[PDB]
C-alpha cells in the first residue's frame, strides 16, 4: 500500500489498532521515504485506548504509541467531543439540512469543484520556492 | 385492489395497529417487537444526492434477552414471510462466506468474483442467530454493509464494488447466560460502542414470571398445542381480508376482533413498500426538539440507564421509523402522530430501569454586593446592574415582595433607598 501511493497520499485509519511489528517498519518510511522508494504523505487516524480521551493521563499513554513515532508526525490534531448545547444544536441542524436538501448548507461562497482543486494542487506542486536569507 | 382501498379507507389509523397485532398469532406478547418487525418489512426510503453520496435506508435491530422468549421463532417467521430472507448463524458462516470473494479460474487464468451471503440478499433480510458467538472480525466486516450497504473488493488484477443494501436481524444471548437485573446493561450486553451505535434499535426481553403472565402464556401454548388442522381425521399420523375465527387459535373472548390473512397482508406490505412518502415541515421541528430533549436527557436520566449511546445516527433512525410508519398507512405526507409513534418506540427501547425568581434575585444581589466591596450601594447602580446583566428587568412589586421576605429573614435592610446587608 505504501509503495502504491508513491508521490501521493497514504490515508490509514485505526492506526492505534495495529501490531507494533508493522509500526516498526513504518518508522523507516516516515524518516527516509524508502522501504524501494515510499515518497508518500502519511495521514494517520487514531482513537483513544478506552474510547474516550482522558486529559488526566499522559498523551503517550492515551495514544499507546511511542514518543518517537508521534515526533516523526509533523502535525498532531486532537478532536474531542466536548458537549456544548449551542454547538450541538448547530451541528444537529446542519446535519438535518444536509440530510434533507441533499446538499451542504448555504455558506458565504460555494466550494470549488473537485477537478478544479485537483488541477490547482497539481499546478502549485510544480513550483519550488527558495527561502530568502533575510 | 378494491379490497385494499376499502380496508385503507375504513381502517384509517388502525392499520399499523392491526398489522402489528396480527403479525404472529402463534407468539404471545411483544407488541413493540412486532411493530419493529412491521417497520422492517415496510422499510425506509433510500435517497440519492446530486453529489452522489448515499444515505442508508435500512434499519438494524438487535434483540437480547433470556432463553425461551420466542426470538428464534420470530426469526423463523420473518424468514418464512420475507421474500429474500437468508439465515446465517454465528459460526456457520465466516467473513469469507458473508463477503464476496475472488477466485482464480484455472481454465482461463483470470480472476472472478463469487458473491457472498449478504451480496445475494439485496434489498432483503439477513437473520443472524447467536450473534454473540460471532467473532469481532466478522462484525467489522459487516460494519461496512451496516453503514453504507456496499462491499469494496480489490485483489491484484481486479477491483470492484458490490451493492449490499440489506436489513439485518440479530439475536444474541447475554454474557452470563441470563440477563442480570442488578448489573448495568453495558456489562450484560458486552459489546463495543460502535457496533451498538451502528444498530438502529435495541430490544431487551425479560422472562418476568408474573402470575397472570405465566397463566396467560401457558393457556396460549396449550390452546396452540391442542389445535388441529380442519379436514383431517383425529389421531392420524402425518381470499378474505380477515381470517376465519377459530375457537382454539383465537378463543371465545377474541370473537370481537379478527386477524388479517397472510396473503392479503403480504400484498398490502408490498403495496406499502411501493409507496414513497414525503416528510413535512411541521414534523421536522417537533422531531428536532425531541432529539434535543433526548440528547439533554443525560441530566434528567434519574436512576434509569441507557442501553445504547445517542449519536447523530439516532436522528436518522427517527426519520426512518417515521417514514416506515407513514408507509404503514397509504398516505403521502408525514403527520404528528407518525413521529410520535417513533418517539414512543425510541423511549421504550433506549431507556431501561417563584423559585427561579428567588435564585436569580440572590445571584444578582451577590454580584452587586461583591462588585462594590462595600456595605452600602447606591440605588441607581443597584437597579442598573440588576437589570443589566439579566435578560428580564424584573417587576418592582415582586422585587419589593422579595425584599420584604428577606427582611423577615434578617438578611437585607433597605433604608432611604440604600441597601445594607
Curated annotation (Swiss-Prot), chain A:
Arginine finger (motif): residue ranges: 71-74
Residues bearing PTM Phosphoserine: 58
Region listing for Interaction with RAD17, in residue ranges: 79-122
Annotated compartments: Nucleus; Chromosome
PTM note: O-glycosylated (O-GlcNAcylated), in a cell cycle-dependent manner.
Disulfide bonds, paired cysteine numbers: none
Residues at which ATP 1 binds: 47
Residues bound to ATP 2: 72
The protein's role, per its UniProt record: Acts as a component of the MCM2-7 complex (MCM complex) which is the replicative helicase essential for 'once per cell cycle' DNA replication initiation and elongation in eukaryotic cells. Core component of CDC45-MCM-GINS (CMG) helicase, the molecular machine that unwinds template DNA during replication, and around which the replisome is built.
Additional remarks: Early fractionation of eukaryotic MCM proteins yielded a variety of dimeric, trimeric and tetrameric complexes with unclear biological significance. Specifically a MCM467 subcomplex is shown to have in vitro helicase activity which is inhibited by the MCM2 subunit. The MCM2-7 hexamer is the proposed physiological active complex.
Family in the record: Belongs to the MCM family.
Quaternary assembly: Component of the MCM2-7 complex. The complex forms a toroidal hexameric ring with the proposed subunit order MCM2-MCM6-MCM4-MCM7-MCM3-MCM5. Component of the CMG helicase complex, a hexameric ring of related MCM2-7 subunits stabilized by CDC45 and the tetrameric GINS complex. Interacts with the ATR-ATRIP complex and with RAD17. Interacts with TIPIN. Interacts with MCMBP. Interacts with ANKRD17. Component of the replisome complex composed of at least DONSON, MCM2, MCM7, PCNA and TICRR.
Name the record gives this protein: DNA replication licensing factor MCM7
First and last residues shown, out of full length: 433 to 576 of 719
Curated annotation (Swiss-Prot), chain B:
Leader peptide range in chain numbering: none
GO molecular function per UniProt: ATP binding; ATP hydrolysis activity; DNA binding; helicase activity; single-stranded DNA binding
Modification after translation (UniProt): Acetylated by MCM3AP.
Assigned EC number: 3.6.4.12
GO cellular component: alpha DNA polymerase:primase complex; chromosome, telomeric region; CMG complex; MCM complex; membrane; nucleoplasm; nucleus; perinuclear region of cytoplasm
Domain MCM, first and last residues per copy: 15-222
Keywords: Acetylation, ATP-binding, Cell cycle, Chromosome, DNA replication, DNA-binding, Glycoprotein, Helicase, Hydrolase, Nucleotide-binding, Nucleus, Phosphoprotein
Modified residues (Phosphoserine): 308
Positions of short motif Arginine finger: 197-200
Protein name per the record: DNA replication licensing factor MCM3
Reaction catalyzed: ATP + H2O = ADP + phosphate + H(+)
Residues of the full protein shown: 281 to 807 of 808
Main location, first listed in the record: nucleus
GO biological process: DNA replication initiation; DNA strand elongation involved in DNA replication; double-strand break repair via break-induced replication; mitotic DNA replication initiation; regulation of DNA-templated DNA replication initiation
Assembly and interaction partners: Component of the MCM2-7 complex. The complex forms a toroidal hexameric ring with the proposed subunit order MCM2-MCM6-MCM4-MCM7-MCM3-MCM5. Component of the CMG helicase complex, a hexameric ring of related MCM2-7 subunits stabilized by CDC45 and the tetrameric GINS complex. Associated with the replication-specific DNA polymerase alpha. Interacts with MCMBP. Interacts with ANKRD17. Interacts with MCM3AP isoform MCM3AP; this interaction leads to MCM3 acetylation.
Note: Early fractionation of eukaryotic MCM proteins yielded a variety of dimeric, trimeric and tetrameric complexes with unclear biological significance. The MCM2-7 hexamer is the proposed physiological active complex.
Biological role: Acts as a component of the MCM2-7 complex (MCM complex) which is the replicative helicase essential for 'once per cell cycle' DNA replication initiation and elongation in eukaryotic cells. Core component of CDC45-MCM-GINS (CMG) helicase, the molecular machine that unwinds template DNA during replication, and around which the replisome is built.
Residues with the N6-acetyllysine modification: 13, 244
Family that this chain belongs to: Belongs to the MCM family.
Residues that coordinate or bind ADP: 73, 113-115, 117
Annotated compartments: Nucleus; Chromosome
Amino acid at each position: 500500500a505504501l509503495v502504491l501511493a508513491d508521490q501521493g497520499v497514504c490515508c490509514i485509519d485505526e492506526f492505534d489498532k495495529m501490531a507494533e511489528a508493522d509500526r516498526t517498519a513504518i518508522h523507516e518510511v516516515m524518516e527516509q521515504q524508502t522501504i524501494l522508494n515510499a515518497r508518500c504523505s502519511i495521514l494517520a487516524a487514531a482513537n483513544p485506548a478506552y474510547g474516550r480521551y482522558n486529559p488526566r493521563r499522559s498523551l503517550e499513554q492515551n495514544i499507546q504509541l511511542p514518543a518517537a513515532l508521534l515526533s516523526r508526525f509533523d502535525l498532531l490534531w486532537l478532536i474531542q467531543d466536548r458537549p456544548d448545547r449551542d454547538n450541538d444544536l448547530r451541528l444537529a441542524q446542519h446535519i438535518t439540512y444536509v440530510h434533507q436538501h441533499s446538499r451542504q448548507p448555504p455558506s458565504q461562497f460555494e466550494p470549488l469543484d473537485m477537478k478544479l482543486m485537483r488541477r490547482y494542487i497539481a499546478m502549485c506542486r510544480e513550483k519550488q520556492p527558495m527561502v530568502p536569507e533575510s | 385492489i378494491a379490497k385494499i382501498k376499502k380496508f385503507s379507507k375504513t381502517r384509517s389509523k388502525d392499520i399499523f395497529d392491526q398489522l402489528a397485532k396480527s403479525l404472529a398469532p402463534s407468539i404471545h406478547g411483544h407488541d413493540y417487537v412486532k411493530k419493529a418487525i412491521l417497520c422492517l418489512l415496510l422499510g425506509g426510503v433510500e435517497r440519492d444526492l446530486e453529489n452522489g453520496s448515499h444515505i442508508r435506508g435500512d434499519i438494524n435491530i438487535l434483540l437480547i434477552g433470556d432463553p425461551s422468549v420466542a426470538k428464534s421463532q420470530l426469526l423463523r417467521y420473518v424468514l418464512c414471510t420475507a421474500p429474500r430472507a437468508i439465515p446465517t448463524t454465528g459460526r456457520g458462516s465466516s467473513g469469507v462466506g458473508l463477503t464476496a470473494a475472488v477466485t482464480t479460474d484455472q481454465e482461463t487464468g483470470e480472476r472472478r468474483l463469487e458473491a457472498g451471503a449478504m451480496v445475494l440478499a439485496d434489498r432483503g433480510v439477513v437473520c443472524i442467530d447467536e450473534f454473540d458467538k460471532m467473532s469481532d472480525m466478522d462484525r467489522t466486516a459487516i460494519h461496512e454493509v451496516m453503514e453504507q450497504g456496499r462491499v469494496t473488493i480489490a485483489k491484484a488484477g481486479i477491483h470492484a464494488r458490490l451493492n449490499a443494501r440489506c436489513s439485518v436481524l440479530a439475536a444474541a444471548n447475554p454474557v452470563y447466560g441470563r440477563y442480570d437485573q442488578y448489573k448495568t446493561p453495558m456489562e450484560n450486553i458486552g459489546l463495543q460502542d460502535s457496533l451498538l451505535s451502528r444498530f438502529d434499535l435495541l430490544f431487551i426481553m425479560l422472562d418476568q414470571m408474573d402470575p397472570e403472565q405465566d397463566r396467560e402464556i401457558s393457556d396460549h401454548v396449550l390452546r396452540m398445542h391442542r389445535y388441529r388442522a380442519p379436514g383431517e381425521q383425529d389421531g392420524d399420523a402425518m381470499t378474505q381480508i380477515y381470517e376465519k375465527h377459530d375457537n382454539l387459535l383465537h378463543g371465545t373472548k377474541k370473537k370481537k376482533e379478527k386477524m388479517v390473512s397472510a396473503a392479503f397482508m403480504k400484498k398490502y406490505i408490498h403495496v406499502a413498500k411501493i409507496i414513497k412518502p414525503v416528510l413535512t415541515q411541521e414534523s421536522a421541528t417537533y422531531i428536532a426538539e425531541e432529539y434535543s430533549r433526548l440528547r439533554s436527557q443525560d441530566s434528567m436520566s434519574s436512576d434509569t440507564a441507557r442501553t445504547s449511546p445517542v449519536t447523530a445516527r439516532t436522528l436518522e433512525t427517527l426519520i426512518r421509523l417515521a417514514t416506515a410508519h407513514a408507509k404503514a398507512r397509504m398516505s403521502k405526507t408525514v403527520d404528528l402522530q407518525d413521529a410520535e409513534e417513533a418517539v414512543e418506540l425510541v423511549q421504550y427501547a433506549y431507556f431501561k430501569k417563584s423559585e427561579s425568581r428567588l435564585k436569580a434575585f440572590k445571584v444578582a444581589l451577590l454580584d452587586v454586593f461583591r462588585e462594590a466591596h462595600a456595605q452600602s450601594i447606591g440605588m441607581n447602580r443597584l437597579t442598573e446592574s440588576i437589570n443589566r446583566d439579566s435578560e428580564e428587568p424584573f417587576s418592582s412589586v415582586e422585587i419589593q415582595a422579595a425584599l420584604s421576605k428577606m427582611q423577615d429573614d434578617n438578611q437585607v435592610m433597605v433604608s432611604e433607598g440604600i441597601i445594607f446587608l
